Amino acid sequence: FRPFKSPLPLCPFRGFFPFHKDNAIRLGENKDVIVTREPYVSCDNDNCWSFALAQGALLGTKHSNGTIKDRTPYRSLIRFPIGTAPVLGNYKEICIAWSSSSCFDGKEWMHVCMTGNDNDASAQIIYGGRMTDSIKSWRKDILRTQESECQCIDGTCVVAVTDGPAANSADYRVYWIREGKIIKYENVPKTKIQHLEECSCYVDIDVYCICRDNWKGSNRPWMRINNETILETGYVCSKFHSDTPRPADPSTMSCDSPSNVNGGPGVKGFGFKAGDDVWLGRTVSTSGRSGFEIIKVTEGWINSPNHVKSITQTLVSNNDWSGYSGSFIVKAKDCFQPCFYVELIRGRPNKNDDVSWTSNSIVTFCGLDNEPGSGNWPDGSNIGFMPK
Amino acid sequence: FRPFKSPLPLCPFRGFFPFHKDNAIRLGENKDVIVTREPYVSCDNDNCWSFALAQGALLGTKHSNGTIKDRTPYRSLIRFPIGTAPVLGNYKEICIAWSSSSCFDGKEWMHVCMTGNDNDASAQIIYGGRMTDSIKSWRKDILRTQESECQCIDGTCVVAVTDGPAANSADYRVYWIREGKIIKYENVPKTKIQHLEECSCYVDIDVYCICRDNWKGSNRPWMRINNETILETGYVCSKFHSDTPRPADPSTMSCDSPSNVNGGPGVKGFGFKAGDDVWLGRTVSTSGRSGFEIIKVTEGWINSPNHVKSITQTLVSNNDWSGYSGSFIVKAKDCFQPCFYVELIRGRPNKNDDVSWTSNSIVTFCGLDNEPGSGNWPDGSNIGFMPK
Amino acid sequence: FRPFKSPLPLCPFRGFFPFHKDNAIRLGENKDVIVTREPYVSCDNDNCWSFALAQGALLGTKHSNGTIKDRTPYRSLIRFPIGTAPVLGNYKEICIAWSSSSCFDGKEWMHVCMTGNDNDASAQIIYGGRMTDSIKSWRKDILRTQESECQCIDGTCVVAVTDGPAANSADYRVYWIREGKIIKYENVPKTKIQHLEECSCYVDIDVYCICRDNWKGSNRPWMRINNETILETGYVCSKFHSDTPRPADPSTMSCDSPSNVNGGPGVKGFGFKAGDDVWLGRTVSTSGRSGFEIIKVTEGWINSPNHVKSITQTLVSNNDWSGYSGSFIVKAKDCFQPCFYVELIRGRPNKNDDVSWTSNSIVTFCGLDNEPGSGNWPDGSNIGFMPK
Amino acid sequence: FRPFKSPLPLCPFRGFFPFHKDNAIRLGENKDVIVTREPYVSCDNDNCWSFALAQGALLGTKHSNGTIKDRTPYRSLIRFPIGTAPVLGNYKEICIAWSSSSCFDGKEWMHVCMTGNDNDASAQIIYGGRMTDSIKSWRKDILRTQESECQCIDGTCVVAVTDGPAANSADYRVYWIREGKIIKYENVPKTKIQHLEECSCYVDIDVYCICRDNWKGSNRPWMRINNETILETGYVCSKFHSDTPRPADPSTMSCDSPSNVNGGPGVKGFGFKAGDDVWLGRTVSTSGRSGFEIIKVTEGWINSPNHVKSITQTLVSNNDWSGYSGSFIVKAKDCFQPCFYVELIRGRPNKNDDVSWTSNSIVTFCGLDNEPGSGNWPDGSNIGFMPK
Numbered sequence A, B, C, D: 001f002r003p004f005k006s007p008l009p010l011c012p013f014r015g016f017f018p019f020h021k022d023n024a025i026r027l028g029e030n031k032d033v034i035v036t037r038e039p040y041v042s043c044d045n046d047n048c049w050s051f052a053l054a055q056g057a058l059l060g061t062k063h064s065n066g067t068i069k070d071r072t073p074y075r076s077l078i079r080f081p082i083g084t085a086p087v088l089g090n091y092k093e094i095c096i097a098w099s100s101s102s103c104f105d106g107k108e109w110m111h112v113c114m115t116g117n118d119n120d121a122s123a124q125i126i127y128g129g130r131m132t133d134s135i136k137s138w139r140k141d142i143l144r145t146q147e148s149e150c151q152c153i154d155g156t157c158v159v160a161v162t163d164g165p166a167a168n169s170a171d172y173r174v175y176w177i178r179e180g181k182i183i184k185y186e187n188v189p190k191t192k193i194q195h196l197e198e199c200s201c202y203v204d205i206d207v208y209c210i211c212r213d214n215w216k217g218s219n220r221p222w223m224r225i226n227n228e229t230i231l232e233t234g235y236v237c238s239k240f241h242s243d244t245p246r247p248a249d250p251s252t253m254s255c256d257s258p259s260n261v262n263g264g265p266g267v268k269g270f271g272f273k274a275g276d277d278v279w280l281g282r283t284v285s286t287s288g289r290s291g292f293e294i295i296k297v298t299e300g301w302i303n304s305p306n307h308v309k310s311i312t313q314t315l316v317s318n319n320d321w322s323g324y325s326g327s328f329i330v331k332a333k334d335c336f337q338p339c340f341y342v343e344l345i346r347g348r349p350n351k352n353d354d355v356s357w358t359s360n361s362i363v364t365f366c367g368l369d370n371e372p373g374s375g376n377w378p379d380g381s382n383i384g385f386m387p388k
């Protein structure tokens, strides 16, 4: 017997430390590794797992040619041991999906899997291995979701979903699901948030989601949610923005609306509120998906004239390719430990990655209340060594 | 401790949704995947599994040349994680078999495995990993069985078996087996059914089997069975037939006998009775094994002048190869959820599939009481990319 | 909690039926499969397992060249799912060994593993994964053991061991081991048995071992053992001999001594006493390791003028290569089901197998109290297809 | 429920016997095996596991070229079934690390993982899969640890750590960690020990560590530790030294300080105190990492004029490459069984190993209170067969 996960506070922390790293591309040189993208991490009571959207092809084979394409019927949400490369011998196929979210509620796994035509997609709700519910596209425009772990409190899981234009006004909803059955949804208030994609969420008593505005905001939109309703929304106040592309530091302090500067497109990212402060992951480049750093902004969560980057951890050099990133939590007695993964994208359309495929490796970090050292943990592949 | 599966009613549903998909051929381009055919799905308390008849060779190797052949000593019923490709690293060999059925009774797995000479085959009964009984060919003419999951109620499993000509009058029996020991069998009444092959079965209080008449019927023969006897038989009334080959819609309403039109040969298929209505899977083509759709026929289960195709879900385009299909169930609290798999056959004898081997990938769908969207989930392989 | 296996009687049976088959050579065409020989089967409470002596090389690689050699430091007893091919992704290395025996006592696995110099080998006793005892070579001449499963009764396991010349008078012992600790041994009485190798054992109240006389006997030596001592010995009375090489049927009825005809060398084989009758496995050829059949000899266990082959099941054609064979049991409520495996040797020194390596596949059969059909289940490899 | 491991005495023993052997290089000829080094073994309640520092590349691929390099971001502590080769299908990635230690405390696994820049590395403490603590480099000079299993008593684990010059005075600490949280550390007294690296530890009531002095000592430094403090230190008295390089036998009896002869560099090794005697592993060569033997020195643990090598077991010939070695224990009722692994290094910089990569296979031995035989268990690879 296992109780449902509880609304625990976020553990104290002051730095992030290297956790698991898969070196999936390096290890895929001999065509053993499954082509993937949009990876993430989520944990149950016994293990943390790597998840990702597979492309139904092995890296370096002819079927991997052209996998830059986002949505096909041959993509499945797959799961593999955290820090290992995904191979036919160790993976599990979760569901058919070109967009997904996963979260464990203390007892069973829930998955949200979008697939089908762009104008008529549906989301399948999987609970304990069984398809228990669905969501039918209501704007008929690429129904899609987080690409990282959802969150569950006292048996009720919460997940953010979008249907509509990627570079214009769209529809954003939160769904509450309990044991695989949709209980309700809410349209996200547009009083502050103007665009919302690929939410990275975690628990700190309530569920906090820090997302991607793909339209007008170089700052990141955010939500605070409990097991019943949306409690609060806004954009991260930090005048040091964390989307890509974005303005140079310092930019505008925009707590209540998109910045309206370098607004589109964007990249999936994450953050952690810490008191009135905020930690923000981001690419080192302001324009491209290269490098990765995480900054702590003093008073960056609130409307203040005192914003300052008190810390900057450089985890992937700007000489190396990054990509998506997202939050996940690990239970730690009476608090949740904040962690994150970084997607290291190799292949198209990256400059000088002369291969026909598109894939990624994974690197992860966790927060501790200790002082960290420093280093660099990039993909590490010599693309010249790879089957094209 | 686990109780035996109960005679639960079929859950309500109004559409079918994409579940698991393995992309096994695409993934087999580098010779990692086991050659298979006659795949299916069956679930225990913890997982759903893919099953299939392997050919004792890896796809794309010289030993895969000529695997169009149906029965050899080198075929085994194998089991692999649902939605993954079958590789040496993840498969389990269940038994030697060129024809099989599998079903979980709540406590243990049962398997029925036919192998040996065509004129002197035997069926091995496996229960909890142990060979517990057997059936000796009594017509000495390719003793064979469902090629999809059997059903068990209150500890007694039911399975349909055929011995005799494939295109003429044969013998059809149902066997009741409890904990691996044959309790009894019955010869299927020929008052209505004239030919019976490859039954696709499920539970809706009683066991319903919808099968393949390979002789005179373009309509599908059916049985209703409990844990003791055959209760009812007939052919699906629907004037919209569901075998391949078959007449164009609409055809004859034949509740009580084979249609006698486009009667031979046929393809393994399935259906679900829903009140007086019936859902029927079928290839899109009336002549070939291409495409896949499932139709709901209003009042299609009964003798009525009101038959109408109220729904048509097109799940595989007619531009893509299909193959066998079959039912399986997943327990859902106090009802059984109806699902199905579709075999996507690639290689010989398919036109323009220029390879020497014969194999398949798998795609699955489950029923929900929600409105579905639409899409297309074919095999997806560029046969030109494959080792021949 | 699990009780120790009990001294159950052998189940009734009247024929043998196809069980698991791995097709390991066929499946090894692309160099995925581990080179092996001396395979066998043994079962615990949850699964039956394939065991074998690996050669520390993959089939078809340069390191597989010359694996005809019997004893090297690079051989390990490995274990893999029954009926699957042994690959790096699914095998477990049990111990370093060029000779082995394995048996489950109801609670834990025991293994006996011989390795080291021919003139100073030692046997390691493994119990529950821990090395718990050892046997030091006392004749300093290739200390060796069964190459098939041992047997355990009420917590005490029994295993036959040989140290000495392979074609002359040697030393033969039985060791009793309880929870991995050697309790005692006995020198096998030479009042009847003159040479003993590679015992195939099973339980029928007491432990019965039917072995290989590599010196003067074309008939097979046998022992009957309980958890304390050797109770009885002799040679199988059947005037229809079951070693290879051997005389044509019928030969001498030699219950009490080796036949002294076609006495050397020999092959590992098995048998099952059934009342006063005996079932005997053997190659179809009287001279070579080709084909495989099992015969039932009426009154073949006793001194009688009425010996007759009442049954002959031909399971591998004489056109196909066989090899070793051995008994194993599967618990069946209140009796033990008799089963056996057959080693299908491919490569050197087999005539027309033009490869540099030596390996094998596996096929198995179990006994039931039903009438069997017929068929042929050989290795199935086209050696011309294989990497040399 | 499982209690924490207890402070059990070391079991009696008088020899060492072949246990598991992986033949990883031989088996890696077809590019399936992960490049590794610094391997070791550690056991939980159910299994013994192989651990190693992977290089994030497959053996024989272009990414394996130049893996002689000690520290990169692409190295992870990985775990695989004991005696199997590490492949993508069977490995688990434990943590990012170019230096590590692992030990099971009776309930959960603990890992210590060093990674990052040489001048700013950190050690991550993993407990039950969760990162629970860290150590920040305090000398900023390659923070590093044992490369073999740590030890845990009554819930408190002990691990030796070094930060500083490799060939000069450095800092050496022991950390006590309970359930993943650092309780305390102590600076190792330099009253006797002058240099300490790569400690090989085991339990004999208290924790004994026998280590590597890389500076002035051809004799090995040692510590005795309980769950609270360092109790004792020194160098192994044995005038028969056990580091590499070292003087010819006999050398100086140096119980209290480094020998000051052939002092640098060194190799990771191990030993077992047995009463006043000591068993010592070592390479057969006094200068190179070739061959492996273990000697028992009478009164070699104490200050005595009676030192004599009473036993010498030659386990790897001097014609074969060895490498690191280390102790591990296996619980045996009411005592701990002493065992050890030997790293068999192949590739650079070994003379005549003409490949660009650097990797290793593994062989292991355990102690029993019986007389052993003899043999030779080297890597066994023909380097000429390998992909370069």
Ligand SMILES: *[C@@H]1O[C@H](CO[C@@H]2O[C@@H](C)[C@@H](O)[C@@H](O)[C@@H]2O)[C@@H](O[C@@H]2O[C@H](CO)[C@@H](O)[C@H](O)[C@H]2NC(C)=O)[C@H](O)[C@H]1NC(C)=O
Pocket: A065, A066, A355, A356, A388
């Ligand atoms: C990756 O694929 C492209 C495109 O492949 C072509 O179209 C595909 C859909 C498929 O049908 C293939 O068979 C086709 O070749 C390759 O680009 C082609 O390369 C050929 C040969 O050099 C050239 O003649 C064509 O003009 C190219 N076609 C296009 C549309 O650009 C490319 O070579 C592949 N890359 C790798 C590394 O294999």
Ligand SMILES: *[C@@H]1O[C@H](CO[C@@H]2O[C@@H](C)[C@@H](O)[C@@H](O)[C@@H]2O)[C@@H](O[C@@H]2O[C@H](CO)[C@@H](O)[C@H](O)[C@H]2NC(C)=O)[C@H](O)[C@H]1NC(C)=O
Pocket: B065, B066, B355, B356, B388
């Ligand atoms: C698939 O196999 C066929 C047939 O293989 C032949 O017969 C088999 C039983 C086996 O013994 C093989 O060694 C034989 O080659 C192949 O067709 C043959 O191809 C050869 C060479 O082109 C030709 O000379 C023969 O006439 C063909 N034989 C027949 C009976 O058609 C075919 O090439 C194989 N396909 C692939 C993709 O390898």
Ligand SMILES: *[C@@H]1O[C@H](CO[C@@H]2O[C@@H](C)[C@@H](O)[C@@H](O)[C@@H]2O)[C@@H](O[C@@H]2O[C@H](CO)[C@@H](O)[C@H](O)[C@H]2NC(C)=O)[C@H](O)[C@H]1NC(C)=O
Pocket: C065, C066, C355, C356, C388
């Ligand atoms: C299988 O191996 C034999 C022998 O290999 C030789 O000796 C081995 C120990 C090893 O050191 C190899 O490098 C040696 O080649 C091979 O037989 C040799 O073949 C070569 C080349 O044709 C020939 O010149 C030698 O005379 C042969 N040596 C002997 C002793 O017969 C054989 O080719 C290998 N078989 C395969 C399929 O690779």
Ligand SMILES: *[C@@H]1O[C@H](CO[C@@H]2O[C@@H](C)[C@@H](O)[C@@H](O)[C@@H]2O)[C@@H](O[C@@H]2O[C@H](CO)[C@@H](O)[C@H](O)[C@H]2NC(C)=O)[C@H](O)[C@H]1NC(C)=O
Pocket: D065, D066, D355, D356, D388
């Ligand atoms: C192992 O690698 C070396 C070095 O590789 C070179 O530098 C690497 C960092 C990488 O960038 C490679 O692309 C480079 O080739 C190889 O040595 C080189 O070999 C080439 C071709 O013979 C020669 O022209 C260069 O001078 C060499 N470079 C150096 C620095 O020595 C070597 O061939 C590789 N070994 C194997 C077995 O592949």
Ligand SMILES: *[C@@H]1O[C@H](CO[C@@H]2O[C@@H](C)[C@@H](O)[C@@H](O)[C@@H]2O)[C@@H](O)[C@H](O)[C@H]1NC(C)=O
Pocket: A007, A154, A156, A205, A226, A227, A228
């Ligand atoms: C929602 O969860 C509640 C949990 O208890 C408390 O109330 C909620 C609103 C949060 O503030 C949480 O942190 C508190 O601990 C339950 O009381 C309530 O029954 C749940 N409601 C539903 C719809 O399940």
Ligand SMILES: *[C@@H]1O[C@H](CO[C@@H]2O[C@@H](C)[C@@H](O)[C@@H](O)[C@@H]2O)[C@@H](O)[C@H](O)[C@H]1NC(C)=O
Pocket: B007, B154, B156, B205, B226, B227, B228
């Ligand atoms: C068969 O199973 C019965 C189950 O109970 C009920 O009766 C059967 C005939 C069905 O109608 C089922 O739906 C009902 O729930 C048992 O009563 C009976 O003992 C069983 N008989 C055998 C041969 O096992």
Ligand SMILES: *[C@@H]1O[C@H](CO[C@@H]2O[C@@H](C)[C@@H](O)[C@@H](O)[C@@H]2O)[C@@H](O)[C@H](O)[C@H]1NC(C)=O
Pocket: C007, C154, C156, C205, C226, C227, C228
């Ligand atoms: C040996 O096992 C005995 C088992 O009980 C019976 O006696 C033996 C000799 C056999 O005939 C068996 O079939 C019987 O069931 C135990 O009585 C005895 O204690 C055991 N002795 C040892 C040495 O463990």
Ligand SMILES: *[C@@H]1O[C@H](CO[C@@H]2O[C@@H](C)[C@@H](O)[C@@H](O)[C@@H]2O)[C@@H](O)[C@H](O)[C@H]1NC(C)=O
Pocket: D007, D154, D156, D205, D226, D227, D228
């Ligand atoms: C340390 O462990 C102790 C174990 O009991 C005994 O005392 C120690 C010092 C050793 O001598 C051991 O062999 C003995 O069995 C506990 O008493 C003590 O509470 C523990 N202290 C800490 C810090 O956990």
Ligand SMILES: CCC(CC)O[C@@H]1C=C(C(=O)O)C[C@H](N)[C@H]1NC(C)=O
Pocket: A038, A070, A071, A098, A099, A142, A144, A166, A197, A214, A266, A267
């Ligand atoms: C369609 C909108 C959406 C969010 C901006 O596009 C995405 C951005 C992507 C990106 O910027 O890398 C790739 C994604 N896999 C994707 N999601 C889907 C379903 O295609």
Ligand SMILES: CCC(CC)O[C@@H]1C=C(C(=O)O)C[C@H](N)[C@H]1NC(C)=O
Pocket: B038, B070, B071, B098, B099, B142, B144, B166, B197, B214, B266, B267
């Ligand atoms: C022998 C009759 C039988 C049913 C019509 O033939 C089948 C039809 C087949 C088909 O139409 O694809 C292939 C099958 N694997 C098969 N079953 C066996 C045992 O060979």
Ligand SMILES: CCC(CC)O[C@@H]1C=C(C(=O)O)C[C@H](N)[C@H]1NC(C)=O
Pocket: C038, C070, C071, C098, C099, C142, C144, C166, C197, C214, C266, C267
């Ligand atoms: C050394 C005597 C022994 C029994 C006759 O030889 C064997 C017969 C063999 C055989 O006839 O195939 C091969 C064996 N693997 C073997 N056992 C060992 C340890 O080498």
Ligand SMILES: CCC(CC)O[C@@H]1C=C(C(=O)O)C[C@H](N)[C@H]1NC(C)=O
Pocket: D038, D070, D071, D098, D099, D142, D144, D166, D197, D214, D266, D267
């Ligand atoms: C930096 C000091 C240290 C101990 C002498 O060097 C080592 C010796 C090595 C050796 O002699 O083989 C290789 C090691 N993997 C290593 N440890 C690290 C972290 O690089």
Ligand SMILES: [Ca+2]
Pocket: A212, A213, A214, A215, A216, A217, A218, A219, A243, A244, A245, A262, A263, A264, A265, A266, A267
């Ligand atoms: Ca943006």
Ligand SMILES: [Ca+2]
Pocket: B212, B213, B214, B215, B216, B217, B218, B219, B243, B244, B245, B262, B263, B264, B265, B266, B267
């Ligand atoms: Ca038909």
Ligand SMILES: [Ca+2]
Pocket: C212, C213, C214, C215, C216, C217, C218, C219, C243, C244, C245, C262, C263, C264, C265, C266, C267
């Ligand atoms: Ca003989």
Ligand SMILES: [Ca+2]
Pocket: none
């Ligand atoms: Ca491969």
